[PDB]
């Protein structure tokens, strides 16, 4: 089950793929609306993978232990500079989450992309599957892949004041090592902004 994903001049290959989950839609909604008066443009150079460590999954983590990553996050590449050069932006996300141990580990992680996530309560975690998601079950796979479009009450956003998407990873069944499994599993994310459009060029700092 080999899958190779390409975003710009960056590729990621997995031999333990369970496929890709498309959330809420297969294609983006109209990118040119009346709120940008035809002044918007696409920035292909930003549509590439950037990386970040999420957390270390250990045996002491119990059901419900979760990690949240609001998007967009700090970006030190071209995508990041866009947020300092333009007032309005929009983009979707191509998300790949990895948790590598071996096939002798047990336990299970749920990774989901949740819109407008202003903290979630304990009982609500039982229904996290309502959101675009995929599981990471060591006996089967080490990679989760989710792809979602831009969402929001506005056609374009101001990322300095609003984060439409939150990546969440939750432990559903605790990690087991059983003598031959990996002692712990570090969870990493490989993310790429998709269809990035910007509008309203800012002045410089000079």
């Amino acid at each position: 089950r080999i899958l190779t994903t390409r975003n710009g001049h960056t590729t990621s290959t997995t031999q333990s793929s369970v496929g890709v989950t498309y959330g809420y839609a297969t294609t983006e909604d109209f990118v040119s609306g009346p709120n940008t008066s035809g002044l918007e443009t696409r920035v292909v150079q930003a549509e590439r993978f950037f990386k970040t460590h999420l957390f270390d999954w250990v045996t002491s983590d119990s059901f419900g232990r979760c990690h949240l990553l609001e998007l967009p996050t700090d970006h030190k590449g071209v995508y990041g500079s866009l947020t300092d050069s333009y007032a309005y932006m929009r983009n979707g996300w191509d998300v790949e989450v990895t948790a590598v141990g071996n096939q002798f580990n047990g336990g299970c992680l749920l990774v989901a992309m949740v819109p407008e996530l202003c903290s979630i309560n304990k009982r609500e975690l039982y229904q996290l599957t309502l959101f675009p998601h995929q599981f990471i079950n060591p006996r089967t796979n080490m990679t989760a892949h989710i792809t979602v479009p831009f969402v929001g009450v506005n056609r374009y956003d101001q990322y300095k004041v609003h984060k439409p998407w939150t990546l969440v990873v939750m432990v559903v069944a605790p990690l087991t090592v059983n003598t031959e499994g990996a002692p712990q599993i570090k969870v990493y994310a490989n993310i790429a902004p998709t269809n990035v459009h910007v509008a309203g060029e800012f002045p410089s700092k000079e």
């Binding site: 809420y24 839609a25 109209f30 040119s32 609306g33």
Partner: protein, 46 residues
């Protein structure tokens, strides 16, 4: 369309009764539910 059951046309124009939608240029979950796998993944005996 929702919980409405009158057989006569509304006395007022649509332009007054409701806001009017505009276009640019159960949808998703209905398609998702309809696409559900509903069989057996293996071989069936008797």
């Amino acid at each position: 369309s929702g919980n409405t059951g009158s057989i006569i046309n509304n006395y007022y124009m649509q332009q007054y009764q409701n806001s009017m939608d505009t276009q640019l240029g159960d949808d998703w979950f209905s398609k998702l539910a309809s696409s559900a796998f509903s069989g057996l993944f293996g071989a069936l005996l008797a």
